[PDB]
Structures are given as structure tokens and as C-alpha cells.
Write a protein that binds this ligand. Structure first.
Ligand SMILES: NC(=O)c1ccc[n+]([C@@H]2O[C@H](COP(=O)([O-])OP(=O)(O)OC[C@H]3O[C@@H](n4cnc5c(N)ncnc54)[C@H](OP(=O)(O)O)[C@@H]3O)[C@@H](O)[C@H]2O)c1
Ligand SMILES: NC(=O)c1ccc[n+]([C@@H]2O[C@H](COP(=O)([O-])OP(=O)(O)OC[C@H]3O[C@@H](n4cnc5c(N)ncnc54)[C@H](OP(=O)(O)O)[C@@H]3O)[C@@H](O)[C@H]2O)c1
Ligand SMILES: NC(=O)c1ccc[n+]([C@@H]2O[C@H](COP(=O)([O-])OP(=O)(O)OC[C@H]3O[C@@H](n4cnc5c(N)ncnc54)[C@H](OP(=O)(O)O)[C@@H]3O)[C@@H](O)[C@H]2O)c1
Ligand SMILES: NC(=O)c1ccc[n+]([C@@H]2O[C@H](COP(=O)([O-])OP(=O)(O)OC[C@H]3O[C@@H](n4cnc5c(N)ncnc54)[C@H](OP(=O)(O)O)[C@@H]3O)[C@@H](O)[C@H]2O)c1
Lengths: 100, 326, 326, 100, 326, 326
């Protein structure tokens, strides 16, 4: 199944396109929303953002919804990322409660 | 407004209108007429000519080549394109295999009496050939200087994206254009799918059959006119389409459109053709013509382009009732 | 069922049967017979012809080339393959060195009077040449348009995988085919090892010596017939094999198989050949033939293909008792 | 916007050139200062330094100024890096206080 | 000091002075004069000759080629450069498209009667062509052996950096030189921006119009001399510049500089030209000349180079009052 | 033991002895003698011939080419190598610039009347040319089929490693060989540094001047013999070396070695030459010869190779007292 490449400040992530289609409203799951960050030269989406956080942001989709904050990533930072990637208020709170 | 425009995001500049050679060159019309048709198109600014190894079993390519060699036009001023896929009765003379793309284009180039073409197209997708093989072959013929660029035709978005993808994967050359069907009764692909590929990977659209093979001209209102394409031997498929329940539904819609046509003071053809260029998503529309009159009429579509207000468009959308949902 | 099939996963379509030129062309048979053999094969649909610089010290290549040039067949309809490794008595005229692959194929191409071959094969592995050098040379001759594709012959799986691996490492072209020996008495490699490479990296198998050099024809039952290959000067090795303890064990098994042959109403050869194609793992089987009769008989194997039920196969497995363990 | 590639002992980082221009006095933000570490063959700046630390050094610019020490990086080490990259005494102290 | 020096960091060695063909070859001067001018330059060590498809609509290229073919000089001893961008009236005959770069250079090479040029330049930037296309085309013509190297002209630093960047991205060949305007009244780019690209990516500067088209020669002090470039038909733009408020301000400054000129015992031209080479950032300065006298005078600038003390420079900076801030 | 051996780890097989053309071809000896020398070497198995654009200002290349064209030997059986660096008096006719490597090899190939050479060498390092440019040019001439492989000469380990490194960086072809000086009085590089590059990156050593220009032959014992190289016009440098304090120290050591020579029953030359091949680190030694006698004597070194026991070696090490510390 057609795969996608996400470059987060040089750290390259790869996943299948359906994995991201599992959450059509999020930024990465919405073609129109992620289109702005596509690099035609390298065939990958680039984000000038926090590297440590994306590990979880991607696992969220692969896990079907699990949103855990990496032990080495501050709470205020990881929260900003969840917001940017547009994961959704639901999953957003669910994270909040699973976190305090 | 802008007569010439970049084919996709490539640096290749093409007229918004081009002249094709399907059915006519080396077939329906005569070489004298072919010559006349091309000269007209040329002197009127059109620099785009499309053909294909399959047209008239190579003959179209011969005629087009002869005209070019006769009028002695400067090669740097023409943008010739040819399509490859069906080049023979043998098993290995069809497809997008490295063997066929090379042999195929070589054969065409010979017929055209040209050292290269500006753009070579895969005439349709090939389920029996790995994408890598195909992109590698396209990239090969371009490095051999047998083509300037390559493009796809009748490929799905995913297929075009796969090609682009493979090219980046192996550092080969991506396709720059998709030659897709587009007219008031075939809008889905060009209007919904291609604009995405245009923005994402810069692939432009070079559309064909603006008059749905003559149908949008309205001349099939009362039936199959003698000497019309649907009447030609070997085009029962077209005749059948025209005389079908669906065929009739269209013709009926033409009558209404015809109104808007007279209203803006231009023929229905000019309306349809100009309708095709209304959106910058389309780089060029390939015209078809059996008469010098048909051609000159069609070229007029350009003047019609300014009159196409958003209202005029919405009106046409209504009568058509086939505007695709993005 | 399907007469033509993709060679491996490449886009190259080949007949399931091809005609080789080992021992016969420019050697055992005459040019008139060679011509006749090829014409028959051609008119019967076979588009695959295999040769090698080493066959009859280049002569096979000359004869094959002449026939092609005489019958004036369209190049795009033939799939010519040649093997490279032994091209001369000098130190540098053997191997898979860049020097030899280039010079070697060039020499062959000249002999064949062809600008290129469809597939060039490494005739055997070369322990004295770095894989990178070899893959780079193969990839070079293909970009120079002296070949459409390349393939291996008599290489181990690991060796083929190494080649594929190196190609991806340096972005060169991987091999598309392995030319391996296959007949009822040589099944291990084709039946166990190659299917894995086929699924994993798409490499297809083009097998040779379907009749184990004439042995599976049964004609060596009572001994060495006059004018048979084992009788030819320079083939003591074959004669010796035939008259060995093991040689006899086989012949004995042939008698039994012969039964199944008459039962399905076809000759033993047709059975063995069709037996080779029974599994889709094999893209094409290269035939050998000294008579026009032998050829026409062999071509008949195709009709036998439908009769090969799973039972018929299991039966043959029994009499053979050499089914390899996956 | 023109992007830059920073190679820290084999670990590749990528950011836009304006992101680094947000702090013109730092080593990475100063053309004349980083020029010494540019590799023309690969089109990237190379630093034979601590890998774990750079994660934060880069986030500093992307975050607009946040300078947190990765939980897995010693205090004495990360401090040296802040010094080398020439982040500035201000941000330097701010880190100190946010750290003790 | 060093008459020959590396063009940028490339291995290409060029004289610090070169002879251009704009306005003169095939235009203002005669073929006999052109021949004379080149022979002089040659025998005096200059190995750099610059031209462009646009100069005298190809004629400059013809004249230069003829001279080379007539004097029978060894090709390995000449460094010919030509610029590409404006090659025709047709839509597709301008720009940096793969089509135009190929056709364009081919046309030029034909005119010059040469198999290749040492360096091909993009005559100016092309907003309508993707950088990738352009770098790929440049890299293509070099692999085809139609050029040894390529370079830019009138491109911004960012643009040059983009080109370099894309080349590394796709493993193509980066530009080695930027042909920029440089004279006492145009210093910003060469003095501030290019040195950075030189140190960072090794791109060297080959500057043009050392005498601001004859202006820095002072001959426009009392007005437009007959037979001077500003007097030539088609150069009203130059005349206008010369006779402008700004034009006059310069001339006025020339008078003062003239002083420093007589002081060091050389003409004002020699001073300006040598002034251009004062900094090792400049690899070579392209000279313009309509007379054999003008040329020999200009070549003298080299002797002036040692006299250019830091004081002399600071003095000139003062009278000019246009030293750019780094 | 093994007469032919892989040049480095490449697939190129070369005789352990080769015949060079420095000083002799087109210079010291006559074309008839050159022909005789080559024919002897050839018929005795040597397939390696080394030359260089600089030798006799191209003449050596002409003579060697003529001999090849006259004896009509099969190209696939010869391994011709030529070195590039000094190809003319002009500024741009020297170095390892893309311009010179291309023009240079082209010129040589023309002189040799050959379409390509088996190996092209950088005759020495070029501080004025970026390694990338050089490796790209070498890789270019090989893809153009003007060379099979490339190699370095007189380059330091670091330099060779840099070349290899750059090739991998840009996916170009690494050098396969370093042509280094090696004889009993010049051992450091070949004995210490190259073996590392051989094991690490497979680069082999093709050594030159086995008899230190005739010196190790002992013929300079009593002085400068008439018609010897040191006597030739233009070789004062050699004469001077021979008649120096150091020169004498060597000759003195020769006397002792001569003993070991008679002891093993062979001439001193054969001893030195065989001494050069004693270690498998050396792929081939290039011989120099002005007489047919000198050549046949030298070829004899091979028979001496088995007698070179570890003791014999240690003994020679003693008398020489110059064994390099690893
Ligand atoms: N990439 C592909 O797979 C593909 C497929 C098809 C076509 N194409 C290309 O696209 C081009 C488009 O050609 P087309 O034939 O499809 O175009 P079209 O515009 O649909 O039809 C042109 C045909 O309709 C008739 N006609 C043209 N102008 C007319 C007018 N003003 N009034 C009345 N009748 C008029 C003509 O004569 P009659 O009908 O009277 O004979 C002519 O043969 C081809 O030439 C070919 O190059 C590409
Ligand atoms: N890649 C490699 O290393 C490699 C190695 C070997 C072969 N090959 C290729 O594979 C091809 C296979 O050829 P092959 O000779 O091995 O094939 P084969 O099928 O084993 O033997 C063919 C030989 O057996 C005899 N024969 C053929 N049909 C017969 C029939 N119906 N009845 C009785 N005898 C019959 C023929 O005449 P006689 O025996 O009477 O003379 C013929 O010479 C070659 O031509 C070559 O192109 C490749
Ligand atoms: N890359 C680009 O876009 C670009 C653009 C422009 C030029 N160039 C190149 O750069 C070269 C520079 O040429 P240029 O014309 O600009 O050079 P220049 O040095 O500014 O002007 C030369 C012109 O000034 C006059 N002149 C020359 N020497 C003189 C002297 N000693 N005393 C008095 N008058 C003198 C000449 O005759 P008259 O004035 O009396 O006729 C001559 O035509 C061109 O030939 C071209 O190859 C490149
Ligand atoms: N890559 C590089 O930079 C480089 C540099 C130098 C050489 N090379 C190559 O290496 C090759 C080696 O040649 P070389 O001249 O250096 O070799 P050498 O073995 O040191 O010297 C050969 C010379 O010594 C004399 N001689 C040869 N055999 C003799 C014998 N058996 N007894 C007495 N005198 C004898 C000959 O005649 P006279 O002395 O009587 O004239 C001959 O000219 C060259 O031809 C060239 O191809 C390469």
C-alpha cells in the first residue's frame, strides 16, 4: 500500500498512506491540510518541529488511537504538538486524563 | 488570456490549443488537407502537435513528418508529441516494456523523420510492466536525446503518483504531463483528480477530444451526417454511442447550451473548447479537425474565453447537471 | 494455457518455448536446416532464440544472425538472447570483467549483425570479478543500448541475490532472469531455490536442456544411436554419462514414464517438455533440435499441458523418486 | 524557504534558514561563524560533537528561545554545548535558573 | 601577478583577461578586425573567449568560429564560452527549458563549428523553468560532451545556491562560475555577495563590462563621440544613460580618477580594468574592444596591477564614494 | 608461479610483467626495434603495455599504435594503458581538469589509433583540480567507452583514499590501480602504504622502473657506458644521480647482490625484477628495454621467482639495509 515519508527536522519517518487515513480529520490524515508541507524534490512531507514528540504522534495512528507522551518529552511541549498535528479534542482530553 | 502557458510546471511552453492527428492524418483526410490544417494552425500560433504510433498504423506519423519537412519550419519552434503502446501485431510490440518503449519511439522517430520528440507519452497504463522498468525506459530515451520529456495518458492519479514516486526513488525523471479526456460530458478526472497532482507534483493536463469526437458540435442532432466521423468505417462504436439512450440525453442538453452559445455570439464548438480552457488547471487542449473551416472555427474559442463569466459557467453547470464533487 | 508469459516480473513477454542454438547452429546441423528450424519455430509463435559467443566458436551466432537478416523478420518481434563468458583463448577473453563483457557482447552483436540483444546473460559465475564490476558492466551495455536486459546463468541464489543487492546499492539495473538447467533428472534449483527469488526479487527462470541433451527422449535405451549427440565428436562426456550406472538407472525410469506418455497419447519428449512448464515458476523452456521433426514434435508439448493433472504429476514423482524437499 | 542541513556526528538535522536567522549572534545563526563547518560535497554543516544535546539546541531556535536540557544528557556536557553553539549569556542564565 | 588562475575552484585555468564578442563580432566591427583582435589576444596569452547565441543573432558565434577554424589553433588551448537564453522569436526559443538549453547549445555549437564549448552559461535566470529541469539539462549537455562545464549569469546568490543545492540533491553537476557585471560603478554583487559563494561552494566570478561599455574610458566627457558605442544604432539606452544626471555624476568622478591614472603613469582604462582584478575574488575580466589599439591598451592593465597599493585603492574608494558595506 | 594475476581486486587480468614505452618508443630506439620488442613480449605472454601522452611528445603512442595495427593482434587480448597529465605547452593542456582528461585521452586514443584504452592513469596528482572534478572526468571517459578502468600514479595513500571516497560519495567509479615506483632502492610506498589500500579498497599496484632506469643492472659500475640511458641527451639528471655519493653507495651494494645473483644462477637484473614480484602485493611490474636481449633477459626473472626463499630475501634485506618499518 502506497507509503508516505515524513521528515521531522531531518529525522525521517515512514508509514503507509492508509495508516494516516485512519484519522481523516487530523492534519496528517487530511490531504488538503498536509499538502502545504510536501516537498516535490524529495517526495516527503517536512516539518520544522520537535523531533522527540513525533514518535508518539505517529504511533497514535499505528496503534489505532493510543496517545502516550514520551517519558523524555516535557508536558507543555508535547501538548503543543498534539494541538498542531490536529489530533482532535477527544483524543486530546483522553491523553490529558491518562496523564493527570 | 495567455496564449502560451507552461505544460504543467515544466519549462516547456505550449499554446493553450494544439492540433492532433487521430483519425485524420494518413486516414480520413488527405495529405494536402493535412498540410493545410497544420500550416493554418502553425501560422495562427499553435506549436503543439500530437500523434501516436498507433494512429493509422504509423501513417499519421509519416504525414505529420512530411509536412514538417516540407514547410521547413524550425524544429525549435515546434513541440511534437507522440504516444507509445500499440506498435504492432507481435507479442512484444505492445506495452510499456523497456523493449517496446525504445523500439517503439525509435520507429516513430524514424517515421516522423525527426531526431526526437518534445514529449513522449505512455498511451495507456501497462499492468504487465513494472513501473520501474517503464520509468527507467522513459528516462533512457530522454538521456539518449530521443525525447525532451515524457508523460502519461489515461493513467489514474495513483499510477501517476507511483511513477513520480519511483523516479524520485531511483533518481530518474518524473512524468510532466497526463493526456486526459475532457469535454462537458467527461469532467471527473480533469476537474477533480488532476489539480491535486498539479499542485503536489507539478504534473500538468493536456486534454483530448474537446468536442467528444464531434458530438458536442451538435451535428448529430438529427442523426448521423454523411462523411462525419460516426459514419466512417471502423467507428461503429462512436455511432452506437451517439444513438444510445445516453447519447441522446446529451444531444438534448446541447440544444440548451446552443442557446448560451448564440447568446455570447459564438458557435457551440467554440463554447465547449473555450469551456475546456476556463480553468488554469488545463495547460492545453488538443483539437481535432477534418476541414480547414472546422479548424478556424475552433481556434475562435480563444476569443470566447473572456466572456466566460462565473455566471455563464454556473448556468452551463446547471444544464449539464454533471458537476463533479471535489 | 498462456502461450506467452512475462520473463520473470519484467515487462519482457516470451513464448513458454524458445529455440536454442547449442551444438546445432554452425555445428551439428546445416545452415539450411538451421534456417528451416528457425522459420518453423517462428511461424509457430516462438519469439525466443538463445545463443552464446562460445557456441561453435561464434559460428552459431553467425548462422542465427544470417537467418534473421534473410527472413527479414521485424526486430521488434524477436527476443534474441546471448550468453557471455568464454570468448577467446587469450587471458582477457574470458570472465565477467568489464573488459570482457563489453568486448564480448560487442563481438557477438557484430556476428549476429544486430545493434543489440534483448537479454545478455553471464554464462556462469566469475569468482575473479567483483560483483560491482559485473553489474556495472551489464548496466553499461544496457544504457549503451547494446542490450535491453541482462540475466544470470548457473549462478547460485546467493550470487543472484548479491547481484540484485549491488544493483540497489549503486542504483544500477538488477538481473531479470537466471538460465538454469531443468529436466526430470535435475530439479532441485528450479523447483526449490528459484521460486523464492521469483517472489522476492522478481527474477524469472528460463530453463535449458529439457530432454537432458536427448536422454529423456528414450533413444538411448539400447545404446548410442548413430548421428545422435552422444555420438558426435567432442561429446564423450555425454556418451559416458549415458552409459554410466546412473545413466542406466534413468533410462530404466524412462520406460515406466513412457507408459504414462502413451496413456496420455503423446510422445515421452512432449511429456518431459510439458512437464517443465507445469509450474508457472518457469517462464520459458529452451528447446534443442537437430531435425525439423524433433522440433515439431517438441512444440506439441503445449497440447499436453492441460492433461497434466495433479495425479499425473504425483505419479511421475513416484517413478522418478527425486522430488526435492522444499 | 531555503533549508539547511546540520550533521552532528552522523545524525542529520534539518531546518529552514530563517529558523536559524532568528538568533543572528549564535554560531549557527551567523553566516560567518558557521561557514567554517560547511561541507561543499554534501551541502551540510558538520559538527564532530555530542549527538544527544543537539536535539535541544535546535529546538531552542524552533521554539523561539526554549532551552531545556534533555533528561538523558548530563549537566556538565549540555552546558559545554550551549557555550560552543554560542547561544548567548542571557539564554544561558535563563537555562541555569530554569535548571537550578 | 599570476596571469592564469583557476576559474572559481574548478580545475579550469583561465587568463585573468578574456576577450568578449558582444556588440563587435558580426556587428560593429568587421571580420578582418575580429580576426585581428582575436589573434592579438591569443598571441598575448588570453585563452578566454566569450560569446552568446543572442549576440548579432548568431553572427558573433559564426565569426568567432571562423577565426578559430582559420588560425587553426589547437582546441585544447582555447577556453570558449557561450551563453544561452534568447535564441529565437518563437515561444519555445527562449528560456532555460531542457528543450531550449539542448537545442540552443546545439545551434551555437554548429555556428561555432565546434564539437563543444568549455563553459556554457544560463544568460540570465528563468522564473518559468524549474531549477531541477535547468540543472538536469546543463548536466546533460556536459555528459553529452557538448560542454566541459556550466555557469550562471545575472543570477542572485540565492539562485546560484539553489542550483548548487539541487545538483547535490540529485547528484548532478553544480555551476562553476557566475558571469557578473563589474566596474567602478557596479560593485555590490561582485564585492559583497559572490565572495561568499566562492568560499562556500567554490563558484568563481567572470566579470563583464569593465569599462561600463566604454564609459569608464572617459571618452564621453564632452559628449557622444561619432563611431562610439553610445552612437551606434540600437544603443539609445546607452546614450541615454551617459547623458543622464547620474551619467554625468560619473563622468565627473572620472576626471578625478584620471588624475590617479596619470600619477601611476597609465591610461584610465588600464586603471579601471586592473582595478577589477585587484581582488583574487575575480577569476577573469572579459574585455570589449572595437580597435586593435583599444585592445592593446586594455591588456596593459596587467602591468598596472602591482602599483595598486592599499592607499591607491582607498583613494579611489573616496573619489567614488560607493564602496559597498559587507 | 601464476603468470597472470588480477590487477588489484578488479576483474582485469594482467601478466606479472608488462612492457613500457618510456624513453624508448618513438625516441631512443627505432620503430623496427619497437616492433620487435613488442612482438617478443607478446609472443611470450605479456598482455600489458604502458605508455603516456607525455612520452616523446606523443610519438611513443604513435609507434605503439602502429605496431598494434600492423601485427593485427586481437584488441581483446591486449591490455593497453596510458597516462595523462602533461599534454601540451598551453596553460589548459596540463593537469587533471575535466577539460584536459577528456581532450588528453581523446588525443592519445587518436594517436594510438584505438577506440579506447584498458586503463587510463592520472600521471601524477593535481593540486589545482578538485578531486570531484577528476573522478567525475575519469568516470565520464569510462562511460563513454574511451577507457575500461582508471588508476592513479604517484599519488599518496590519502590522495588515493580521497578519490575512492569521492567516488562512493557521488556513486562514480573508484580507481583500481596506482602506478608506483619500485625497485630495491625505492621500497617504502609499495611495501608499506599500498598493501593497506589493497586490502581495504582493493587498489592494486603496477610498479615501474624495476631496474631504477638501468642502474640495478650494474652496468654503471665503472662509469657511464656509451649508448646507455644516463648517456642520452636530456638525461643529465640520471647521470648526476648515478655519479652521486648516494649513487655510488648503491652500485657498491650491487656488487654484493651480484654474488647472490651468480649463486642462484641468474643475472642481477632477473634477480631485481623477480625481487619486485616476490610479494603478491604487486600485480605487475613494467619493464623497460632498449635491446631485444635486455628484454629476453628480463623476462627470465620469472624462473627466478621460485628460488626466492625467505632466507635469500632476508640476505638481500641485509646487504640493502633499507627494509622499511611497517
Ligand atoms: N491520449 C489519448 O489516449 C488520446 C485519445 C484520443 C485522442 N487524443 C488526441 O487528442 C486529439 C483530439 O482529437 P479528437 O478527434 O478527439 O477531437 P474532437 O474535438 O473531439 O473531435 C474532432 C472531430 O470532430 C469534428 N469537428 C471538429 N471541429 C468541428 C466543428 N467546429 N464543427 C463540427 N464538427 C467538428 C471533426 O470532423 P468529423 O467528425 O466531421 O470527421 C473532427 O474529426 C487527437 O487528434 C489526438 O491527438 C489522445
Ligand atoms: N545457460 C547455459 O549454460 C546453457 C547450457 C546448455 C544449453 N543452454 C541453452 O539451452 C538450449 C537447450 O538445448 P539442449 O540441447 O540442452 O536441449 P535438449 O532438449 O536437452 O536436447 C536437444 C537435443 O536432443 C535431441 N532431440 C530433440 N528433440 C528430440 C525429440 N523429439 N526426439 C528425440 N531426440 C530429440 C536433438 O538431436 P540429437 O541428440 O539427435 O543430436 C537435440 O540436439 C540450448 O540450445 C542453449 O541455447 C544454455
Ligand atoms: N553575461 C552577460 O549578461 C554579459 C553582458 C554583457 C557583456 N558580457 C560579456 O562581457 C564582455 C564585456 O564587453 P563590454 O563591451 O561590456 O566591455 P567594456 O570594457 O565595458 O566596453 C568595451 C567597449 O568600450 C570601448 N573601449 C574599449 N577599450 C577602450 C579603450 N581602451 N579606450 C576607449 N574606449 C574603449 C570599445 O569601443 P566603442 O565603445 O568605441 O565601440 C568597446 O566596444 C562582452 O564582450 C561579453 O562577452 C556578458
Ligand atoms: N607512472 C609513472 O610516472 C611512470 C614513470 C616512469 C616509468 N613508468 C613506466 O614504467 C616503465 C618502466 O620503465 P623503466 O625505463 O623505468 O625501467 P627500468 O627497468 O628501470 O629501466 C629500463 C632501461 O634500463 C636498461 N636495461 C633494461 N634491461 C636491462 C638489462 N637486462 N641489462 C642492462 N640494462 C638493461 C635499458 O637500456 P639503456 O639504459 O641501455 O638505454 C632500458 O631503457 C616505463 O616504460 C613506463 O611505461 C611510469
Amino acid at each position: 500500500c502506497e507509503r508516505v515519508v515524513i521528515n521531522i527536522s531531518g529525522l525521517r519517518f515512514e508509514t503507509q498512506l492508509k495508516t494516516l487515513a485512519q484519522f481523516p480529520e487530523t492534519l496528517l490524515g487530511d490531504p488538503k491540510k498536509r499538502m502545504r508541507y510536501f516537498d516535490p524534490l524529495r517526495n516527503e512531507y517536512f516539518f520544522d518541529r520537535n523531533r522527540p514528540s513525533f514518535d508518539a504522534i505517529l504511533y497514535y495512528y499505528q496503534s489505532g488511537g493510543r496517545l502516550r507522551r514520551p517519558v523524555n518529552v516535557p508536558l507543555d511541549i508535547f501538548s503543543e504538538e498534539i494541538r498542531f498535528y490536529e489530533l482532535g479534542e477527544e483524543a486530546m482530553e483522553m491523553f490529558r486524563e491518562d496523564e493527570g | 488570456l495567455q496564449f502560451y502557458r507552461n505544460l504543467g510546471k515544466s519549462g516547456l511552453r505550449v499554446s493553450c490549443l494544439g492540433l492532433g492527428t487521430w483519425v485524420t492524418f494518413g486516414g480520413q483526410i488527405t495529405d494536402e488537407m493535412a498540410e493545410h490544417l497544420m500550416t493554418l494552425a502553425y501560422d495562427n500560433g499553435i506549436n503543439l502537435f500530437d500523434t501516436a504510433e498507433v494512429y493509422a498504423a504509423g501513417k499519421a506519423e509519416v504525414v505529420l513528418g512530411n509536412i514538417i519537412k516540407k514547410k521547413g519550419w524550425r524544429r525549435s519552434s515546434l513541440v511534437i508529441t507522440t504516444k507509445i503502446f500499440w506498435g504492432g501485431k507481435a507479442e512484444t510490440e505492445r506495452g510499456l516494456s523497456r523493449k517496446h518503449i525504445i523500439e517503439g519511439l525509435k520507429a516513430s522517430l524514424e517515421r516522423l523523420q525527426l531526431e526526437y520528440v518534445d514529449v513522449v507519452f505512455a498511451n495507456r497504463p501497462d499492468p504487465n510492466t513494472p513501473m520501474e522498468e517503464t520509468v527507467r525506459a522513459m528516462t533512457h530515451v530522454i538521456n539518449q536525446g530521443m525525447a525532451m520529456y515524457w508523460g502519461t495518458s489515461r493513467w489514474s492519479s495513483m499510477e501517476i503518483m507511483e511513477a513520480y514516486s519511483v523516479a524520485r526513488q531511483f533518481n530518474l525523471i518524473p512524468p510532466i504531463c497526463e493526456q486526459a479526456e475532457y469535454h462537458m460530458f467527461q469532467r471527473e478526472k480533469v476537474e477533480v483528480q488532476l489539480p491535486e497532482l498539479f499542485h503536489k507534483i507539478g504534473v500538468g493536463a493536456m486534454t483530448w477530444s474537446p468536442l467528444a469526437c464531434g458530438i458536442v458540435s451538435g451535428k448529430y442532432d438529427s442523426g448521423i451526417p454523411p462523411y462525419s466521423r460516426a459514419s466512417l468505417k471502423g467507428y461503429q462504436w462512436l455511432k452506437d454511442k451517439i444513438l444510445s439512450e445516453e447519447g441522446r440525453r446529451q444531444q438534448a442538453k446541447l440544444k440548451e447550451l446552443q442557446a448560451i452559445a448564440e447568446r455570447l455570439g459564438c458557435t457551440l464548438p467554440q463554447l465547449a473548447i473555450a469551456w475546456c480552457l476556463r480553468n488554469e488547471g488545463v495547460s492545453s487542449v488538443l483539437l481535432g479537425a477534418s476541414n480547414a473551416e472546422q479548424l478556424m472555427e475552433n481556434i475562435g474559442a480563444i476569443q470566447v474565453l473572456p466572456k466566460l463569466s462565473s455566471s455563464i459557467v454556473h448556468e452551463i453547470d446547471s444544464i449539464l447537471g454533471n458537476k463533479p464533487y471535489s
